[PDB]
Amino acid sequence: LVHVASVEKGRSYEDFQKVYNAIALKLREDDEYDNYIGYGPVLVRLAWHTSGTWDKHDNTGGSYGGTYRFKKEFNDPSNAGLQNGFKFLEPIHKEFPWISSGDLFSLGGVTAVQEMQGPKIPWRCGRVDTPEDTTPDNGRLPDADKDADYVRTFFQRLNMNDREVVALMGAHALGKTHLKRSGYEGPWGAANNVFTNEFYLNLLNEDWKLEKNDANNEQWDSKSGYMMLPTDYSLIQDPKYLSIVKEYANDQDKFFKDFSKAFEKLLENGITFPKDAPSPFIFKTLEEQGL
Numbered sequence: 181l182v183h184v185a186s187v188e189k190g191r192s193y194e195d196f197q198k199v200y201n202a203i204a205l206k207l208r209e210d211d212e213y214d215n216y217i218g219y220g221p222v223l224v225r226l227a228w229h230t231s232g233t234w235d236k237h238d239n240t241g242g243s244y245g246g247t248y249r250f251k252k253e254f255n256d257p258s259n260a261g262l263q264n265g266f267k268f269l270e271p272i273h274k275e276f277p278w279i280s281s282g283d284l285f286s287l288g289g290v291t292a293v294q295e296m297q298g299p300k301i302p303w304r305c306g307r308v309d310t311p312e313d314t315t316p317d318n319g320r321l322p323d324a325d326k327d328a329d330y331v332r333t334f335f336q337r338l339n340m341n342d343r344e345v346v347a348l349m350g351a352h353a354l355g356k357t358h359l360k361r362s363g364y365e366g367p368w369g370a371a372n373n374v375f376t377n378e379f380y381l382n383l384l385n386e387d388w389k390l391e392k393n394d395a396n397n398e399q400w401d402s403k404s405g406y407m408m409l410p411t412d413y414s415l416i417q418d419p420k421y422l423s424i425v426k427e428y429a430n431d432q433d434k435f436f437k438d439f440s441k442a443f444e445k446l447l448e449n450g451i452t453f454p455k456d457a458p459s460p461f462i463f464k465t466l467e468e469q470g471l
């Protein structure tokens with residue numbers, strides 16, 4: 181099935197910058213969430229999980245249809261906690277009812293990365309809501325207790341290569357694991373609501389110990405109070421991933437540029453953009469607007 185991007189009727193860059201801005205202003209205002217981490221990280225994860233159900237083989241799932249709004253997908257165990265990002269976006273959607281669900285979930289992620297002093301992420305509009313029976317089944321999002329071979333094979337289904345995977349994983353600088361949500365507990369670093377390359381630096385430079393958490397799952401822990409999932413740690417066990425990790429630990433601009441590309445790609449997988457669609461939008465941050 182082909183999913184052709186269809187611009188919300190009559191809308192242009194300024195309309196979407198207004199949505200961006202409302203998201204960004206609420207991100208700033210609602211700062212208490214998650215022990216003052218704020219909603220940035222869970223909005224990035226919402227964008228990823230609503231996009232990451234995609235299957236390149238038959239174009240099922242993906243960001244286009246905004247299917248997270250249906251109970252099979254919002255109740256996926258893999259999505260535990262993302263209801264907080266959805267609830268955040270609800271007043272945004274009420275103010276701007278014309279935006280599609282897929283466009284809002286993906287734009288939430290872009291806005292969060294940028295407002296957290298991350299790279300600019302070009303973003304295209306035109307996702308169209310699809311019906312409840314187009315919601316992908318549970319089980320398409322990745323397990324955390326696995327090795328590099330798992331990770332590499334998993335991401336082939338999203339048409340991501342080694343560089344794209346290692347870049348995307350850098351988003352684990354953000355937020356934290358929550359025991360009651362995933363069976364893992366702890367942040368990955370100190371700067372967890374500012375977008376930086378800290379994930380790679382911590383992988384290489386902390387002294388990690390393989391411990392069991394209080395849900396009886398293994399994770400890697402440091403004396404600084406940071407953690408890595410087994411799938412994170414796999415990026416330094418596999419020599420191909422390791423090279424790339426070192427590259428991003430040593431070049432913040434390269435990480436930003438590669439993350440931006442991979443994240444846009446993730447958010448656009450499955451969508452066909454007509455030849456005469458608008459160019460991708462690059463939104464100004466609140467700071468750049470003086471707001």
Ligand code: HEM
Nearest residue numbers: 221222225228322323324348351355356357358361362411
């Ligand atoms: C092998 C792939 C991946 C696995 C197994 C994985 C697994 C996890 C797990 C278990 C959590 C903790 C959930 C919780 O307890 O709240 C988490 C959090 C998160 N992940 Fe992933 N993840 C992967 C890839 C990604 C990618 C590709 C992105 C986005 C580019 C991403 C962004 C995030 C963010 C931002 C959080 C923090 C959420 C919060 O603080 O509420 N993850 N991930």
